[PDB]
Structure 1
Amino acid sequence: NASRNAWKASGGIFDIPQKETRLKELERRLEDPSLWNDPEAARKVSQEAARLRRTVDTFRSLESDLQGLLELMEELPAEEREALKPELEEAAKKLDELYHQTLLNFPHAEKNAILTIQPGAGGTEACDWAEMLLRMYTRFAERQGFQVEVVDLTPGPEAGIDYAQILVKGENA
């Protein structure tokens, strides 16, 4: 578990050479008012600043909860340090949040989607496969607190489903 945590934390370090240098560059050339006179430049700096800002708030957890863990977590987990081991649960959560953030933020990523499922060759077998696939996606939606709206469903003759087109809506679908 500890090892896993460490591994997770290493990713966060992975974005230390990005944040510092970038920040420095931004303050050095972009922050300036005579650079600012061009809107595009300003916009660029703002984008650049965004990168910096992400790195600031979320790295603290990685550093602050790592360094404070070892002194109290070493020998005792059950007695007196039952808070102190599940104190690192908070850290884990933070890490997860960071990772998830990294994953998302990209174009159109919040707006819900409408996946069509199309079968392949095999004919009868294939339709069953399609159905199975559909089922899995439905269950995923169910799992993740989504609401699925069933639009197209088309049965195949010998068995299964030929064509389906399923639209789910909610939080970063």
Structure 2
Amino acid sequence: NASRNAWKASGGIFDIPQKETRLKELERRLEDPSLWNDPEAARKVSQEAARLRRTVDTFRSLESDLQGLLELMEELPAEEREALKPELEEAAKKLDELYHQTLLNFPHAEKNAILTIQPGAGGTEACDWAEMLLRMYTRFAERQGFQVEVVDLTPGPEAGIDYAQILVKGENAYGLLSPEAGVHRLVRPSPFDASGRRHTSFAGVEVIPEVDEEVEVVLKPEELRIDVMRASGPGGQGVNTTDSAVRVVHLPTGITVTCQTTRSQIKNKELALKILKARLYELERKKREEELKALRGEVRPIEWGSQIRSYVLDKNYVKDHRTGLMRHDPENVLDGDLMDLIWAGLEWKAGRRQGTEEVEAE
């Protein structure tokens, strides 16, 4: 375990120098009264000042755990060496605190997620893999200790799955699956090829939380404006001196509907409203899906030029391309061994990527 220890120390270490200097600029800032007489200003001041709580304790606590262990650890099979080992068992649940502080920082990491597998380049073979990944991610959820609700499944032509979708019930289901989007490369002799040669195939994967609605809130009076007016066409003297035309304009969007079918202003206002609803509902509905089209913008590559992590069963080895990391047990990987992988590699990269972007050019 000496390996993952120095690793967690390395994570906390680069935090040190950066937040080291970042703290010193901020602290002498919080000294002046002129700084505080700017209320909203010294708010975000005390915010960064706050971040120095999670910064300090990690470095301090972890720094001392490295050294102390190193000493009474090197050599002994019985006495004081096994005395020092379970002192780091509590330090192992303190490694726990560290990891939780690196993952939980997603928009909706904490809530359950929704995974979807959709095959790609590779034909009948490509979809055979889609199902392999289905069981893969499914099987992982069982071990993570999570309930899997399969929302939709659709077997393909020969091999079985043109598409599939799942609901990983639990907590941090999203934060955990989050770094599993993108395509996946799969090399092997094709169980469908009459010659059996090596064939690359590609499946797609995506992931998402869950949310609410907004409909009726809009029909609130003060937002729209209703005009009356004489109708048009037939009515005789009735249509003349009887205004039964109605037009509800939805001021917030300008969108409007007008109606003058019946002879009743009340029955016409009733109708217009009932149609403005449906129109206004579709607009707001699109806007919802239009936000998910900007979540397609978060990542939405093609289908086989691009990859994320290769799985070759020939030479036995998976390879997350995002991290350079490797392995040689695609069998185990295609079963659930993801914690270690996702944890470090995926979280690290994902978080450090967007994080360093945000604090350097975003």
- Separation in structure 1 between the aligned mates of residue 70 and residue 158 of structure 2, nearest angstrom: 63
* Cα distance between partner residues in 2 of 1:32 and 1:106: 34
Shift of 1:172: 27
TM-score normalised to the size of structure 1? 0.81
Relative to 1, partners in 2 of residues 1:2 and 1:115: Cα closer, same or farther, differing over 3 Å? closer
Aligned in 2, Cα 1:120/1:3: closer, same or farther, shift over 3 Å? closer
- Report the CA distance between 1:137 and its aligned residue: 0.7
Q: Which structure has the highest helix share of the two? A: 1
2:82 partner SS: coil
Change (3 A) 1:33 1:110: farther
- Contact kept? 2:27, 2:49, Cα under 8 Å: no
Match of 2:144 in 1: 144
Displacement after TM superposition at 1:148 (Å)? 1.4
Q: After the TM superposition, which of the residue ranges 30-39 and 134-143 deviates more from structure 2?
A: 30-39
Measured after TM superposition, the shift of residue 3 of structure 1 is 5.4
Contact between 2:75 and 2:81, CA under 8 Å: does it hold in 1?
A: no
Could you report, residue by residue, the CA deviation over 1:116-146 in whole angstroms, capped at 9, with x for unpaired residues? 1111133322221111111111111111111
Identity %: 99
1:4/1:107 Cα in 2 relative to 1: closer, same or farther (>3 Å)?
A: closer
The secondary structure found in structure 1 opposite 2:108 is: coil
Are the equivalent residues in 1 in contact too, given 2:12–2:59 (CA < 8 A)?
Answer: yes
What is the aligned partner in structure 1 of residue 265 from structure 2?
none
The higher-RCO structure (CA 8 Å, 6+ apart) is 1
Bigger shift: residues 73-82 or 133-142? 73-82
| Whole-angstrom distance in 1 between the partners of 2:69 and 2:148 | 43
Per-residue deviation at 1:4?
4.9
Evaluate the alpha carbon distance shift between residue 172 and residue 140 of structure 1 in structure 2; reply closer, same or farther with a 3 A threshold. Answer: farther
Q: Mean Cα displacement is larger for which, 148-157 or 28-37?
A: 28-37
Kindly tell me: are residues 159 and 69 of structure 1, through their superposed partners in 2, closer, same or farther at Cα, counting changes over 3 Å? closer
| Pair 102,46 (structure 1): closer, same or farther in 2 beyond 3 Å | farther
Tell me, yes or no, if the aligned pair for 2:154 and 2:162 is still in contact at 8 Å.
yes
How far apart, CA to CA, are the structure 1 residues paired with 2:23 and 2:165? 45
- Equivalent residue of 2:119, what SS? coil
Preserved contact between residue 131 and residue 160 of structure 1 (Cα < 8 Å) = yes
Q: 1:90 & 1:4 partners in 2: Cα distance?
A: 15
Distance between the aligned counterparts of 1:81 and 1:133, measured in 2?
Answer: 44
Equivalenced residue count is: 172
**Aligned-pair CA distance for 1:37:** 4.0
Q: Which moved more, 1:149-158 or 1:59-68?
A: 59-68
User: Please, what is the CA RMSD of the aligned residues?
Assistant: 4.4
Which segment drifts farther, 111-120 or 76-85? 76-85
Deviation at 1:54, TM superposition (A): 0.7
Offset, 1:55: 1.2
Q: Is the 8 A contact 1:141 1:168 kept in 2?
A: yes
Query: What SS is found at the alignment partner of 2:361?
Result: coil
Aligned partners of 2:153 and 2:163 also within 8 Å: yes
Distance 1:156 1:90 in 2: 50
Q: Distance in 1 between matches of 2:20 and 2:7?
A: 22
Shift of 1:165: 1.3
Distance 1:138 1:36 in 2: 53
**1:105 and 1:6 mapped to 2: Cα distance?**
23
Cα offset, 1:166, TM superposition: 0.8
- Structure 1 contact 109–172 (Cα < 8 Å) conserved: no
Q: Are the structure 2 counterparts of residues 107 and 37 from structure 1 closer, same or farther at C-alpha, using a change threshold of 3 Å?
A: farther
Give secondary structure in 1 for the equivalent of 2:58: helix
Partner-residue secondary structure (3-state), 1:161 = coil
1:172 aligns with 2:357: no
| Shift in CA distance, 138/69, structure 1 to aligned 2, threshold 3 Å | same
**What is the 5 A alignment of 1:84-163?**
84-163=84-163
Post-superposition CA distance 1:74-106 (Å, at most 9, x none): 332433431312322333442343144224413
In the alignment, the residues of structure 2 paired with residue 110 and residue 137 of structure 1 have an alpha-carbon distance, to the nearest angstrom, of 18
Select between 141-150 and 62-71 the one with higher mean Cα deviation.
62-71
Q: How has the CA–CA distance of structure 1 residues 155 and 172 changed in structure 2, closer, same or farther, with 3 Å as cutoff?
A: farther
Q: Is the 8 A contact 2:114 2:165 kept in 1?
A: yes
Q: Which stretch shifts more, 106-115 or 91-100? A: 91-100
Distance 1:148 1:122, change over 3 A: same
Query: How many Å separate the matches in 2 of 1:40 and 1:138?
Result: 47
